[PDB]
């Protein structure tokens, strides 16, 4: 085996001691009294030294073989960086959920009504996009990190401004900086999800059940694919020190316990730092699954059985040009076997809001070709976003 350790880069061994310590019954005459390092044969052996008073700036942590939270088995914690390879495959294998291409008919029946629209939705969203893309800062070409959350909150405010039409939107709040935690088993493999996204929307009333019992019972006959050359524990933080818990981001007494729609952000000014679309889909699937599992553990206790009242925890992940909608629904908690009842989720892939934006007018031979403005626009993405936002409040 070719070792990766260079002798010139590692710490060199200390020189051997002199020929005075190998004499049984003879004490050496070193320089331990003059308190300075000498040229004259002087190099003894100093005993270890420790500090009697602990200092936060000079505190050493003990090794991992005696921590109070150390266990024999290693867990797998997923957060907001674990770039999974086979995103959808690992997501469906760890969450036990059937993949559905199209979206449910409820959001379509709620969004196709011409009355539930803005007085001038197209011009409003165009002005919002133009502002967030160019009129946000003093620079000419803003970075993705400085306009992604800006346009996110702009769209959130635009969707919230329709409270005067539907007297039910006042029961929402955009919670910032939240942490999730949910532990479960997956074929003798202890798993745990712990992430902190951008923002989340929490309501006081839970979302209604989407999938009825018919499709729930029919999904039992659906089997899940499993890759063989790759292990499902790939691209996961394998650690031995952890702590099992089923507590969500809010305890008892909080006015907004039930979530609604999770908002994940990929703020990165570089392509290598941005996540793949399949990776973002897997991340939002895992986040929705963790939220639903935490809600099930908090409401129906810590039991592994089938839930008679399913919960709906939606999610959506953007990046500054494309959108990825998600409608997740948990139906059971026992995930030890792969022959039981599966879950249902509606994933809408490939949803572009606009083709390209030109912050500066291109001039080819003293004449312009494309003026300043979002060239190419698809209102279907904004319609689906408004539908997912208004699905909570009828």
């Amino acid at each position: 085996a070719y070792e990766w350790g260079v002798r010139s880069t590692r710490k060199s061994e200390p020189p051997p001691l002199d020929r005075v310590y190998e004499i049984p019954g003879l004490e050496p005459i070193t320089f331990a009294g003059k308190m300075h390092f000498v040229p004259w044969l002087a190099r003894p052996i100093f005993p270890p030294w420790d500090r009697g008073y602990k200092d936060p700036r000079f505190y050493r942590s003990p090794p991992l073989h005696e921590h109070p939270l150390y266990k024999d088995q290693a867990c797998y914690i997923f957060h907001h960086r674990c770039r999974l390879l086979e995103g959808v495959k690992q997501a469906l294998w760890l969450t036990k959920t059937k993949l559905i291409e199209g979206l449910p008919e409820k959001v379509l029946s709620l969004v196709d009504d011409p009355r539930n629209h803005i007085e001038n939705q197209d011009e409003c969203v165009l002005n919002v996009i133009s502002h967030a893309r160019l009129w946000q800062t003093t620079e000419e070409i803003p970075k993705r990190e400085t306009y992604c959350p800006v346009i996110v909150d702009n769209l959130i405010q635009l969707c919230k401004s329709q409270i005067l039409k539907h007297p039910s939107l006042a029961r929402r709040i955009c919670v910032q900086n939240s942490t999730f935690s949910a532990t479960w088993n997956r074929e003798s493999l202890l798993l745990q999800v712990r992430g902190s996204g951008g923002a989340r929307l929490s309501t006081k009333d839970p979302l209604p059940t989407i999938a009825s019992r018919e499709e729930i019972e029919a999904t039992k006959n659906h089997v899940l694919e499993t890759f063989y050359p790759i292990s499902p524990i790939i691209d996961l933080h394998e650690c031995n020190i952890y702590d099992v818990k089923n507590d969500t981001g809010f305890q008892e007494g909080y006015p907004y316990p039930y979530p609604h729609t999770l908002y994940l952000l990929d703020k990165a000014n570089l392509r290598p730092h941005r996540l793949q679309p399949d990776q973002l889909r897997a991340k939002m699937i895992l986040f929705a699954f963790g939220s639903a599992l935490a809600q099930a553990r908090l409401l129906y206790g810590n039991d592994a059985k089938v839930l008679e009242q399913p919960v709906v925890v939606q999610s959506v992940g953007t990046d500054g040009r494309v959108f990825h909608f998600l409608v997740f629904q948990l139906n059971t908690t026992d995930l030890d076997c792969n022959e039981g009842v599966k879950n249902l989720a509606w994933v809408d892939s490939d949803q572009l809001l606009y083709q390209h934006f030109w912050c500066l007018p291109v001039i080819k031979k003293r004449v312009v070709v494309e003026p300043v403005g979002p060239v190419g626009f698809k209102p279907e993405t904004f319609r689906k976003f408004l539908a997912l936002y208004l699905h909570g409040a009828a």
Partner: protein, 176 residues
């Protein structure tokens, strides 16, 4: 307040100020401890006022009315400092029994000069420090020639001084 930095308003420009006879060592040794501390504070305030007056006189391009008061306060505070240092040394000899509260030892540097190294008081010990170990303390056989040359130079200096003294004595005996 801020009016203590000046003298009496009636003495604002009275040519000569009558103030003399500073403190002595015996009068300072006769006092206790709190009295000496309060007297030191009063002398410090007086020296600050005199410094302000001297600065104002130097800015106004006029001579100082009484410059001897500053020297008097200075020597009084120096005598008080000497008294308190002697008291501290006596107490240290009665308790610990070692002179000079600054510890150290006679160590030879690289230049071969027998100097008195003063301890810097660190946190970590010396057998693992990074900066203290880089401070060498050995002559190494190459400075003996320089030490011999310095000794010869000092011997020449002393011999020339003795020759000058002898020439002066001869001139004194010849003229007188």
């Amino acid at each position: 307040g801020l009016e203590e930095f000046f003298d009496d308003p009636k003495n604002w420009g009275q040519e000569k100020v009558k103030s003399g006879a500073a403190w002595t060592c015996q009068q300072l040794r006769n006092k206790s401890n709190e009295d000496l501390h309060k007297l030191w504070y009063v002398l410090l305030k007086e020296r600050n006022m005199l410094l302000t007056l001297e600065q104002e006189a130097k800015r106004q391009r006029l001579p100082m009315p009484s410059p001897e008061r500053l020297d008097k306060v200075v020597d009084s505070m120096d005598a008080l400092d000497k008294v308190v240092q002697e008291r501290e040394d006596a107490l240290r000899l009665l308790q610990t029994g070692q002179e000079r509260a600054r510890p150290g030892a006679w160590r030879r540097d690289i230049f071969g000069r027998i100097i008195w190294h003063k301890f810097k008081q660190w946190v970590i010990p010396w057998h693992l420090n990074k900066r203290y170990n880089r401070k060498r303390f050995f002559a190494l056989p190459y400075v003996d020639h320089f030490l011999r040359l310095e000794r010869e130079k000092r011997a020449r200096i002393k011999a020339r001084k003795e020759n000058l003294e002898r020439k002066k004595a001869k001139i004194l005996l010849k003229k007188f």
